[PDB]
Design a protein around this ligand. Structure first.
Ligand SMILES: Cc1cc2nc3c(=O)[nH]c(=O)nc-3n(C[C@H](O)[C@H](O)[C@H](O)COP(=O)(O)OP(=O)(O)OC[C@H]3O[C@@H](n4cnc5c(N)ncnc54)[C@H](O)[C@@H]3O)c2cc1C
Length: 370
């Protein structure tokens, strides 16, 4: 009768998988290691592909209300605008991480997904067992490893992988828009503000709504001023003086952290009844803003393959075969862009860069052609 899924991880990948499975009539239980349900990273972009997953999950309206689509995606090199991109209408959106995480949480609770906090997966067995840190062993028809880049569900089984960490990172914060204090300009835009001279510092400027601005402040990890948290106000204001009012607000934040991106690429995403989804399987460089989009699409697509009449084992193989190449291509191009600083040139959201974004998981076609 009722098939049972056990989901490890309460981030975007696990919440998506749980809602999608619960909508399809699975009895789903989700285990989050932290003692509360929360998302870190300040703010996030979604594109059409992820917005369509939110549509599929019945969470799109709660996300659109209180989030923002800029008039254009603008790039600056040394304070000179080099490009303005609108992607031929392809939907996209900027929001805080808690905004998106709360909508997914509220939808999971509305459907009756069983959520356990302080509940950490430490091992999984392909025969359909999940072991928690308490020792408790759970049996199920499907085990979803949505437990992030340091996945114990993945590493307890052993998956061949390439896993590494970027040299440099950034500080991500949410501050008031301060729109009046910013004065004349195009302050509803996304503005990716690059500089190599006098020093390597960059700010990704990302309005989330009329009240909240997501800033990503990026400097080399070896720069002891640019990499400091709480931020070293003077070194940011010096290169970004037109954002002083916002930077003053950022400088007050105690909760800011300098984070380096970590990636993982595996040969396989499945082992018997175990599927790995999201960062657990395919964490990637930040450049195309698609790590959570691909997580959500992959989690949603897993639920679709499980509706085919097949064994869970054969549905997982079919899932990875069908959907993985979109993520593999997206991760490769993002890695290339990050390492080569390619977004600094502007006009880099090409049709190939935009592939993952254009994919509609609901109809399983590419839309929004370029
Ligand atoms: C600098 C940067 C900027 C980014 N910007 C974007 C962007 O704009 N748009 C985009 O789509 N993506 C972006 N990403 C990618 C995005 O942050 C991740 O790809 C996405 O959060 C992955 O979601 P997830 O559910 O797989 O993993 P996570 O978000 O890591 O969630 C995993 C959850 O599992 C919990 N957990 C961990 N281990 C266990 C365990 N063993 N048992 C149970 N629970 C566990 C964790 O507490 C967490 O709650 C960005 C990433 C970086 C580094």
């Amino acid at each position: 009768k009722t098939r049972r899924a056990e989901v490890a991880g309460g981030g975007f990948a696990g919440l998506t998988a749980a809602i999608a499975l619960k909508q399809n009539g699975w009895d789903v239980r989700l285990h989050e290691k932290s003692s509360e349900l929360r998302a870190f990273g300040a703010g996030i972009y979604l594109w059409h592909n992820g917005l369509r997953v939110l549509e599929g999950l019945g969470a799109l309206d709660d996300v659109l209300q209180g989030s923002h689509t800029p008039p254009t995606y603008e790039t600056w090199m040394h304070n000179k605008s080099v490009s303005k991109e609108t992607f031929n209408g392809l939907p996209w959106r900027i929001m805080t991480r808690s905004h998106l995480h709360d909508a997914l949480v509220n939808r999971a609770r509305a459907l009756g997904v069983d959520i356990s906090v302080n509940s950490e997966a430490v091992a999984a067995d392909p025969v359909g067992r999940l072991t928690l840190q308490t020792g408790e062993v759970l049996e199920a028809d499907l085990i979803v490893g949505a437990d992030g880049v340091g996945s114990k569900v993945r590493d307890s089984i052993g998956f061949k992988q390439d896993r590494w960490v970027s040299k440099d990172g950034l500080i991500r914060l949410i501050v008031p828009r301060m729109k009046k204090e910013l004065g004349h300009g195009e302050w509803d835009n996304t503005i990716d503000m690059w500089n190599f001279w006098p020093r390597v510092q960059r700010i990704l400027y990302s309005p989330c709504n009329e009240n909240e601005l997501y800033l990503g402040l990026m400097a080399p990890a070896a720069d002891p001023r640019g990499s400091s948290v709480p931020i070293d106000l003077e070194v940011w204001v010096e290169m970004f003086p037109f954002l002083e009012p916002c930077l003053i607000e950022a400088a007050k934040l105690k909760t800011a952290r300098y984070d380096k991106a970590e990636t993982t690429k595996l040969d396989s995403w499945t082992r018997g009844k175990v599927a790995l989804v999201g960062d657990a399987a395919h964490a990637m460089c930040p450049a195309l803003a698609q790590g959570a989009g691909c997580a959500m699409v992959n989690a949603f697509s897993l639920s679709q393959d499980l509706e085919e009449g097949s064994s869970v084992e054969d549905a997982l193989v079919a899932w990875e075969t069908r959907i993985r190449p979109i993520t593999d291509r997206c991760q490769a191009l993002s890695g290339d862009y990050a390492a080569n600083r390619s977004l600094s040139k502007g006009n880099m959201f090409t049709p190939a860069a935009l592939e993952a974004a254009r994919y509609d998981p609901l109809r399983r076609v590419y839309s929004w052609p370029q």
